[PDB]
Design a protein around this ligand. Structure first.
Ligand SMILES: [Mg+2]
Ligand SMILES: [Zn+2]
Ligand SMILES: [Zn+2]
Lengths: 168, 172, 270, 57, 447, 111, 168, 83, 144, 55, 115, 66, 71, 56
């Protein structure tokens, strides 16, 4: 492989280097092998990245994996969207899958949760417990048929007497 | 037939009528021949429909000569033979023709491909698809608008439209 | 030979086609004349069909369309008033022609119905209109429908004045050939030569008629299209010379109407 | 089934078909039940009495 | 409705026909064509909804897509080819046509521009009318490969005070490019100005193309004798190389690349040789084509077509592949009953050495049918899979809010990003720029 | 069915005028004339004849939509020349040319 | 060096050169002190947080580091005095336009960024072509990419089809 | 819970706020509310609302809700309109 | 209103993938540093290699009676009349264009770039000696 | 019942029986009728192998 | 070799010069073509029946459809087609069709519904 | 079913040419092109009108009427 | 109880002269009349169109007020 | 999932779309029948009393 190592004179030049590609995931023991660089070892599997590294390293690896996924079709996606997605997926201390066993098992409102997966199970759970739905989400307001506090609904409009008597 | 009716050829080139023109407004050749249909050339390179042009040339040759043209696959018929026959008839080697604008009668550059082509009318007509509802019949259980053009139904505002409107920020 | 206006030269004449050359005339005038001749000449055609008995295998709309597509004599068409401008309820003798068609199956073999079977029951008042045009050696005319023994067809048709712009059934011309500048002296088009332009593109039949072949002279940028070769074909309702005369008359009438409207609006403004 | 050995149209000629108000271009092969034409779609199944070997996961 | 651009607010215009009519430039965000598509229309029932739809979901307000940071609308279809042909150096327009085109463009000041050539005959260049359509105050400068201030190939772009100086307008200027004219107009002037520019350009290009004409024919995909001879020679050389590789492998004299067996390396070499031969034949066919070719003209404009289309239509069709490999042995060591056992020749394994114009033999016809069936099945599965994935993704992040403290929080109020995008900037208001400090040498930086 | 009547494209409706002139403020001595029920046939001829004049500085026409048979004609003349006078002169020249052409064609056909 | 940034300085300076006609020959009116003070004032005038406490001030300071670096690169004294030759009024106009564009480029509070990110990620997924094969380089490892890879990333699969590892 | 000297929100006026204010003013005008500016013969409530917003003559107050629950009140006439 | 005048013997004419527009390079026969590279329409002006073409750059086409003025910009160009007179009557090829570049090469040579609606011309000469009165919006007249 | 509803079996247990065996004849076009009279279907129900065109 | 095609695919002229998806689309859409489905109409009572006014044999016939009776019962018409960019009203997949031909009886049909 | 009265493209009347076309095909043993040329159909637009026409009226007439 | 209800009528004058239709609805001076050949509905003044018999015969004007019958 | 977050609505229409180069960027060609069917409620105001009376 070729790396853009800066030249001693100041410019950037391509310095070829040897790169080892492996078909297995055992980075816990590979990093301890002498003669390699432990500060540059990378694994395409982000699940075990945080087993030896931190949660932030796992989030960075997940973002890199997503960027590599959207790389061949030629489409360009702004960094903010993918960064927000990976931050949501790593808000807690571990990976939060986008499925019924991941972001679903949260502390959000039951009404907003139960609109995607199976419903009656979570409704029965809510009935058995006594949790309170704050109704500050979008799904709850859609169900109740009220203006959700999003976009134009993020604020309140009031009338003032002082300005009313000011003009006339 | 009217605007919106679906029409297609024998090569998977489907489409609908967008506009209609009279004989005077249509382009004409030096012999006074006007086309029944006009097709955009942009549909050819993407779909790789060479057989459309080959069949057009073969149909032109057959109409000029009066003998049925053989379009069976895996035969010895080549484009060169059709071109030679067309040149012998004295029209063009490749089927291009010189037409005129018609609106002004001026000569048109970029000579146009011409020739008969088989076309078929599909079962999809705009008359059977246009729908509009404004406070029509009412359901019983859900008390929501009924479904179906025949019973004056209403279009469904699905979930995808809901998140689209949410992303737009239009809460009201 | 009348003034320095457009000049004509008839090459070939016949009962259905006329070939002439237009000179000392601009392209716009020739194009407008062609458009008027193809879509502005008033003619006579069947517009309303009343069906009494139809036991044939063809639908009523089918027979109505076929009858409406049948050409009719329109020589004295200027003596017939438009239905919309006529002071009558539906149709009278001064604004329409009534034709009746009766067909029955007597012989065991198929009995064809032709356009010659139409009979005019109205009063033409000496006008030469309404007669179906039969351009055929046998004299039968346009075939309408075929019915076998037992089947009976009986209907009444009404012919009214109209122009080709409203419907294509009122068009008196079939196809009009329009061409100018047989050689590319004006450079109005770019040829699609693959190896050579001269060999690949056949020469038009109008190349020999005047227009001497170009040489290696510099391109003339001060030249304009002034010679046009036209061939007008008539369906049969109107003679070709009458078709051209009526086209010129219609264009003149349209321009005169524009001038009259301008004068009227000027008078109203003042 | 139409145009079968037990059908009246098996031995009918063109004139007989025309007299019986039947299109000579019709090919048959369909059942007429309750006034509606029904066609049995062929069902595709694996052949029996055949030894087959496959490898599991 | 995948993205927010699938929902737009338009202005009602009553038309005398029973169909929906829309501008050709809005089809790209809608991802719709006119082969029988169906689209829904909703009307508001109150002043609140009407005003918020007009001020939030208007079509000109969504010219720049926040997803790809590029405009989602541009000049497409025959308008692109018309604008490419109009801006050619040799394109000249006479007085009457110039007057007609000037009158066709609305909001025209009524001032006739001075013709480029005045002495022999008054002639207006094609770029003059487009510059008239383009509003003043917009400056653009794009340099392509080998482009200078006196570029002989008429490439690149340079606009000063809304006047075209040099460069043929193509998909890189009036398309969906980030640095295109549409993006600059939208960023400098208002969205209404951008919509007016869209309309004026479309009208003028359509009027010019109506009286000029553009067509295509069978002969556009026909090459001359020497080109076909060279293509056949290249195909024969590739077949000879493949045969030599097979002979070497059969004698066990071919080394195996590390990490793979002999079969995988042999198949990789064969497919590489076949793809290289197809690419070379296509490049030769494209080079042979003249500038007057309709397919080539469409290719330069970028409206439709590509190099691979020309290659497959004129020179040679690519090797048919199923599941990423050549045609497998459906029979016992055979692909078709018409071949012999253990035949590894490219013809027997699914290589189409013919072209669409020339015609296909039954074997390659069957192989192409198999490839097309595989492609159709792939799209049929993929559309459903991506739809489910999109639904899950929308459900996952359906309650993320940017609050008045410039922090992004969910419904529960938990903070997931202390500042949106780590910079607090709107996606639609970001443009690609070059940092001059990072690059260069130390001496150049000091100088 | 929303299909318009076929006669609506060549018959003047109630409350409609064949000609309607509006002054143009973009340039001095410029007017815009809107015609009804015409489809390019008089427009091309009138534009060509107006351009044939020497006192006319601008002459163009356009059809906004093929659905409606109506075109707008814009004429700009030199100082002291009324555009209506130019239109009348062009119409008179067209009438004279058409009459001469008809007479010549009749004379040629007579032999 | 090519990275997306909020405000296009090059377009602003080109517009300011086109207007306020530059003679390119007469000496400029800007002084070193004026240029430096204007650049510093423009840097201080960029507000994205508008706080008073130390934490918000630090966040605002370090949230515009890239833009400040770009502004310093594009508004150097030598660059202004040699290439972008402007006058005092032109320099003030450039500074005002840059500040106005930066303040107008801030994200409006109340926007649904999660839905926008989800749509911006899901649209290329639908727009992608077949992604089951052909993802092989020098060695035909059949690396998973595209729709299946995206699905397994979103589901956080513990057993990926083609695990990989890179050693430097 | 209505601070004034500690208002950390942006002084500019957001697109959503502008749309909501224009809609509310237009609806009130449509339902026959008093108008504090001359109309110049205009008859469309929405354009009247835009004209009122142009000279900042709309007697409305924007209440921006903080995520915790606190809020600050911003007058329409004191909000800078730049979009 | 004249701003330039030379002989400019032309050589090496080769349009390149074109049929109506040719690129001609010329060098002045008086000055050893003057150079020209201009695009012309050979359909109306069919020049050939090794030819002398007197060129002239003028700010306006008005006669010497009317001095140069800035009121001639955006005048809504009118078709030429019969009795009108202009400097173009003495030449065979007149083109209108705008200057868009002023580059400095070596120490005393400057290049002026013009665009006549798409046709570009590059002119070189001695700074402050020959090309010292060229600003923008100048005609180009060529004589056989 | 079997020839009308298309469920091959008795009246009861129709849920566990195959469906679509019997279909109404398509008589829109002669070619359509000919195609419908020579149609085969394999009851499968995610899998790309059975849908591929085998050699 | 041409005998391997089906009933729908036997109508396509020169199927070997087209891409496989195009052939599949044409085969699928051929069953929706409107024409004379049977000569027994006018005596039958079907729910829907669409027949063509003037069906025409294709000019580019194929030997395979001789036994399919396609020439006896065609499902289309021979229309003159010009491939051009005229007026910009036929973009994408739209087409421009002559009004005079429509008035003269081109592609018009009959509709039958039974209760 | 029956021969169209007029040519779709241009508008030439071909309603009496069907019987003559059949007679020329079955008496004089001419090919289709020569018969078309003899009938006067020069443009291929008119030639295709009767060259590719199906006479389905006879099949309908085969059925017994009422 | 309008007389012009469910009666075969013929439209005179205007652009629909000679057409045959049946009155469906009456709205004051304007009445809705369908068309036989054309599949559309048009509204015209009831005093304009003539009145015919259901079976067929002579036609009369709007004088049917004095004779509440057909024909 | 079928009656709360997604439901059928009134004042909506659906018909085949088509292209029109003469239309503006933000403009949709509505058929006359659809316009005559779909309605919008407008509150009568002194600024539109005459227009509303004419429409009625
Ligand atoms: Mg589509
Ligand atoms: Zn009368
Ligand atoms: Zn014809």
């Amino acid at each position: 492989y070729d790396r853009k190592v800066p030249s001693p004179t100041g410019e950037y030049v391509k310095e070829p280097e040897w790169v080892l590609e492996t078909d297995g995931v055992n980075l816990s023991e590979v990093m301890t092998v002498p003669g390699i660089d432990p500060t540059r070892i990378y694994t395409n599997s982000f699940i075990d990245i945080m087993e030896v590294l931190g949660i932030e390293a796992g989030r960075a690896a997940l973002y890199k994996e997503v960027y590599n996924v959207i790389a061949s079709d030629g489409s360009y996606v702004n960094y903010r969207h993918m960064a927000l997605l990976v931050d949501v997926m790593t808000t807690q201390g571990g990976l939060t899958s986008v499925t019924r066993h991941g972001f679903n098992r949260s502390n959000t409102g039951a009404l907003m949760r139960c609109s995607f997966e199976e419903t009656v199970e979570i409704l029965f759970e809510a009935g058995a417990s006594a949790e309170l739905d704050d109704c500050r989400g979008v799904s709850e307001n859609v169900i109740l048929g009220q203006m959700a506090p999003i976009g134009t609904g993020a604020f309140d409009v009031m009338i003032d007497e002082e300005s009313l008597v000011k003009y006339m | 037939p009217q605007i919106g009716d679906k029409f297609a050829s024998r090569h998977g080139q489907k489409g609908t009528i967008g506009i209609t023109y009279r004989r005077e407004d249509m382009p004409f050749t030096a012999e006074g021949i006007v086309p029944d249909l006009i097709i955009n050339p942009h549909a050819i390179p993407s779909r790789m429909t060479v057989a459309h042009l080959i069949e057009c040339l073969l149909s032109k040759v057959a109409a000029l000569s009066g003998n049925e043209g053989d379009a069976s696959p895996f035969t010895d018929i080549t484009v060169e033979g059709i071109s030679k026959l067309l040149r012998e008839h004295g029209y063009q080697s490749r089927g291009f023709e010189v037409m005129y604008n018609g609106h002004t009668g001026k000569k048109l550059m970029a000579q146009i491909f011409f020739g008969p082509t088989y076309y078929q009318r599909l079962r999809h007509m705009v008359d059977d698809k246009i729908h509009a509802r404004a406070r029509g019949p009412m359901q019983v259980l859900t008390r929501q608008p009924v479904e179906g053009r025949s019973r004056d139904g209403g279009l469904r505002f699905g979930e995808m439209e809901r998140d689209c409107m949410i992303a737009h920020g239009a809460a009201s | 030979m009348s003034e320095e206006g457009p000049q004509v030269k008839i090459r070939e004449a016949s009962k259905d086609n006329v070939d002439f050359i237009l000179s000392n005339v601009d392209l716009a005038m020739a194009n407008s004349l062609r458009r008027v001749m193809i879509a502005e000449i008033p003619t006579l055609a069947i517009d309303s069909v009343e069906v009494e008995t139809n036991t044939t295998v063809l639908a009523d709309e089918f027979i109505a369309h076929r009858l409406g597509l049948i050409p009719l004599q329109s020589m004295d068409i200027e003596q017939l008033e438009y239905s919309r401008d006529c002071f009558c309820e539906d149709h009278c003798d001064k604004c329409s022609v009534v034709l009746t068609l009766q067909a029955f199956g007597e012989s065991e073999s198929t009995t064809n119905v032709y356009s010659k079977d139409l009979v005019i029951v109205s009063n033409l008042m000496g006008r030469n209109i309404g007669h179906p045009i039969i351009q055929d050696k046998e004299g039968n005319g346009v075939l309408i429908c075929k019915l076998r023994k037992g089947q009976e067809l009986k209907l009444t048709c009404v012919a009214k004045k109209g122009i080709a712009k409203e419907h294509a059934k009122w068009g008196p011309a079939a196809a009009i050939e329009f061409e100018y500048d047989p050689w590319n002296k004006l450079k109005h088009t770019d040829y699609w030569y693959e190896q050579d332009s001269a060999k690949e593109w056949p020469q038009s039949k109008n190349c020999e008629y005047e227009d001497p072949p170009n040489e290696g002279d510099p391109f003339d940028y001060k030249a304009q299209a002034d010679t046009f070769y036209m061939n007008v074909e008539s369906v049969g309702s109107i003679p070709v010379d009458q078709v051209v005369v009526r086209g010129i008359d219609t264009l003149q009438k349209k321009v005169a109407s524009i001038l009259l409207a301008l004068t009227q609006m000027d008078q109203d403004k003042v | 089934m139409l145009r079968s050995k037990n059908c009246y149209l098996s031995e009918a000629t063109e004139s007989d078909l025309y007299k019986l108000k039947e299109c000579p271009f019709d090919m048959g092969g369909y059942f007429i039940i309750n006034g509606s034409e029904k066609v049995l779609i062929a069902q595709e199944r694996s052949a029996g009495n055949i030894v087959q070997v496959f490898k599991k996961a | 409705s995948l993205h927010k651009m699938s929902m737009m607010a338009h202005r009602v215009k009553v038309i005398p026909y029973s169909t929906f009519r829309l501008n050709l430039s809005v089809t790209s965000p809608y991802n719709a064509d006119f082969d029988g598509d169906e689209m829904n229309l909703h009307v508001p029932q109150s002043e609140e909804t009407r005003a918020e739809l007009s001020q939030l979901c208007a079509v000109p307000l969504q010219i720049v897509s926040p997803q790809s940071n590029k405009p989602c609308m541009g000049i497409v279809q025959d308008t692109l080819c018309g604008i490419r042909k109009l801006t050619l150096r040799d394109t000249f327009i006479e007085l009457d046509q110039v007057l007609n085109m000037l009158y066709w463009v609305p909001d025209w000041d009524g001032v006739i521009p001075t013709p480029a050539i005045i002495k022999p005959k008054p002639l207006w260049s094609g770029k003059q009318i487009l510059s008239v359509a383009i509003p003043n105050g917009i400056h653009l400068q794009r340099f392509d490969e080998g482009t200078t201030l006196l570029s002989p190939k008429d490439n690149g772009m340079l606009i000063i005070d809304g006047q075209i100086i040099f460069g043929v307008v193509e998909k890189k200027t009036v398309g969906s490019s980030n640095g295109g004219l549409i993006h600059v107009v939208t960023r400098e002037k208002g969205p209404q100005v951008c919509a007016k520019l869209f309309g004026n350009i479309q009208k003028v290009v359509n009027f010019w193309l109506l009286h000029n004409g553009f067509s295509t024919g069978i002969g556009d995909t026909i090459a001359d004798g020497p080109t076909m001879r060279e293509i056949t020679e290249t195909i024969a050389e590739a077949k000879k190389k493949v045969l030599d590789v097979t002979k070497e492998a059969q004698a066990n004299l071919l080394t195996a690349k590390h990490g793979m067996t002999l079969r995988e390396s042999f198949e990789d070499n064969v497919v590489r040789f076949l793809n290289e031969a197809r690419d070379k034949a296509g490049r030769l066919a494209e080079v042979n084509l003249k500038d007057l070719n309709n397919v080539k003209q469409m290719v330069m404009a970028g409206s439709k077509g590509s190099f691979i289309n020309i290659a497959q239509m004129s020179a040679c069709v690519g090797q048919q592949s199923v599941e990423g490999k050549r045609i497998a042995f459906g029979f016992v060591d055979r692909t078709l009953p018409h071949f012999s056992k253990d035949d590894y020749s490219p013809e027997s394994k699914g290589f189409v050495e013919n072209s669409y114009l020339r015609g296909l033999t039954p074997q390659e016809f069957f192989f192409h049918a198999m490839g097309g069936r595989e492609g159709l099945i792939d799209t049929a599965v993929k559309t459903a899979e991506t739809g489910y994935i999109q639904r899950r993704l929308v459900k996952a992040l359906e309650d993320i809010m940017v609050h008045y403290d410039n922090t992004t929080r969910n419904s529960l109020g938990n903070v997931i990003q202390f500042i949106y995008g780590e910079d607090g900037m709107d996606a639609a208001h970001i443009e690609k720029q070059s940092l001059d400090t990072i690059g260069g040498s130390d001496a150049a930086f000091e100088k | 069915m929303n299909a318009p009547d076929r006669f609506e494209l060549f018959l003047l409706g109630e409350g409609e005028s064949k000609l309607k002139i509006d002054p143009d403020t973009k340039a001095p001595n410029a007017v815009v004339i809107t015609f009804e029920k015409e489809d390019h046939t008089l427009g091309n001829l009138i534009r060509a004849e107006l351009l044939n004049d020497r006192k006319v500085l601008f002459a163009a026409y356009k059809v906004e939509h093929p659905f409606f048979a109506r075109f707008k004609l814009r004429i700009q003349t030199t100082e002291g020349y009324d555009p209506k006078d130019a239109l009348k002169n062009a119409c008179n020249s067209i009438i004279n040319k058409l009459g001469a052409l008809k007479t010549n064609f009749e004379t040629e056909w007579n032999l | 060096a090519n990275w997306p940034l909020p405000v296009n300085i090059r377009r602003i300076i080109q517009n300011a050169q086109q207007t306020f006609h530059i003679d390119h020959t007469k000496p400029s009116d800007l002084t070193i002190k004026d240029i430096v003070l204007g650049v510093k004032d423009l840097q201080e005038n960029l507000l994205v947080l508008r706080g008073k406490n130390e934490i918000i001030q630090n966040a605002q300071r370090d949230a515009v580091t890239l833009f400040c670096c770009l502004l310093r690169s594009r508004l150097a004294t030598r660059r202004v005095l040699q290439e972008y030759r402007l006058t005092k009024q032109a320099f003030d106009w450039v500074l005002s336009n840059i500040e106005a564009q930066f303040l107008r480029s801030v994200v409006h509070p109340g926007e649904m960024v999660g839905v926008l990110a989800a749509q911006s990620i899901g649209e290329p997924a639908t727009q992608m072509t077949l992604n089951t094969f052909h993802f092989a380089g020098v060695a035909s490892k059949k690396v998973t990419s595209g729709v299946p890879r995206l699905k397994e990333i979103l589901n956080v699969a513990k057993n990926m089809k083609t695990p990989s590892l890179t050693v430097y | 819970a209505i601070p004034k000297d500690q208002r950390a929100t942006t002084p500019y006026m957001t697109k959503y706020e502008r749309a909501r204010i224009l809609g509310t003013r237009a609806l009130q005008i449509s339902m026959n509310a008093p108008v504090f500016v001359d109309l110049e013969g205009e008859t469309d409530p929405l354009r009247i609302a835009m004209k009122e917003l142009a000279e900042k003559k709309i007697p409305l107050v924007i209440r921006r809700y903080l995520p915790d629950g606190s809020f600050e009140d911003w007058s329409v006439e004191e909000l800078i309109v730049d979009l | 209103n004249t701003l330039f005048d030379d002989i400019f013997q032309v050589s090496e004419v080769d349009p390149g993938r074109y049929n109506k527009v040719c690129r001609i390079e010329a060098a002045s026969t008086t000055q050893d540093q003057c150079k020209l590279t201009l695009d012309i329409n050979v359909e109306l002006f069919p020049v050939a290699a090794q030819d002398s073409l007197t060129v002239t750059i003028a700010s306006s086409l008005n006669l010497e009676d009317t001095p140069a003025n800035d009121s001639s910009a955006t005048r809504s160009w009118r078709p030429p009349q019969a009795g009108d007179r202009s400097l173009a009557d003495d030449y065979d090829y007149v083109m209108y264009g705008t200057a868009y570049k002023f580059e400095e090469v070596s120490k005393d040579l400057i290049a002026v770039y013009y665009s006549f609606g798409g046709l570009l011309m590059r002119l070189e000469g001695n700074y402050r000696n020959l090309n010292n009165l060229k600003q923008e919006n100048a005609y180009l007249l060529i004589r056989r | 019942y079997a020839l009308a509803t298309g469920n091959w079996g008795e009246q009861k247990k129709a849920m566990s029986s195959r469906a679509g065996v019997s279909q109404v004849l398509n008589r829109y076009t002669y070619s359509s009728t000919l195609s419908h009279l020579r149609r085969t279907n394999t009851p499968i129900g995610k899998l790309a192998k059975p849908r591929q065109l085998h050699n | 070799p041409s005998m391997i095609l089906g009933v729908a695919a036997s109508i396509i002229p020169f199927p070997d010069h087209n891409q496989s998806p195009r052939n599949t689309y044409q085969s699928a859409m051929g069953k929706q073509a409107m024409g004379v489905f049977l000569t027994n109409y006018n005596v039958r009572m079907d729910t829907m029946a669409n027949i063509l006014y003037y069906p025409q044999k294709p000019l580019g016939t194929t030997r395979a459809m001789e036994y399919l009776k396609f020439r006896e019962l065609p499902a289309g018409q021979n229309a003159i087609v010009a491939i051009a960019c005229y007026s910009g009203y036929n973009q994408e997949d739209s087409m421009i069709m002559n009004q005079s031909s429509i008035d003269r009886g081109l592609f018009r049909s009959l509709f039958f519904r039974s209760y | 079913m029956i021969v169209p009265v007029r040519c779709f493209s241009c508008g030439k009347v071909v309603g009496d040419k069907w019987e003559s076309y059949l007679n020329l095909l079955q008496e004089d043993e001419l090919d289709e092109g020569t018969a078309l040329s003899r009938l006067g159909l020069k443009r291929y637009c008119c030639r295709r009108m009767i060259l590719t026409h199906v006479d389905l009226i006879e099949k309908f007439l085969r059925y017994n009427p009422l | 109880r309008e007389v012009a209800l469910g009666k075969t009528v013929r439209i005179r004058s205007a652009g629909y002269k000679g057409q045959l239709g049946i009155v469906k609805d009456v709205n004051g001076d304007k009445a809705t009349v369908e068309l036989h050949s054309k599949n559309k509905h048009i509204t015209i003044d009831k005093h304009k169109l003539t009145y015919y018999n259901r079976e067929g015969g002579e036609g009369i004007t709007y004088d049917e007020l004095v004779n509440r019958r057909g024909r | 999932r079928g009656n709360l977050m997604g439901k059928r609505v009134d004042f909506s229409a659906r018909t085949v779309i088509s292209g029109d180069p003469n239309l503006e960027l933000d403009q949709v060609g509505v058929p006359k029948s659809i316009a005559k069917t779909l309605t919008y409620p407008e509150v009568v105001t002194p600024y539109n009393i005459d227009r509303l009376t004419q429409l009625v």
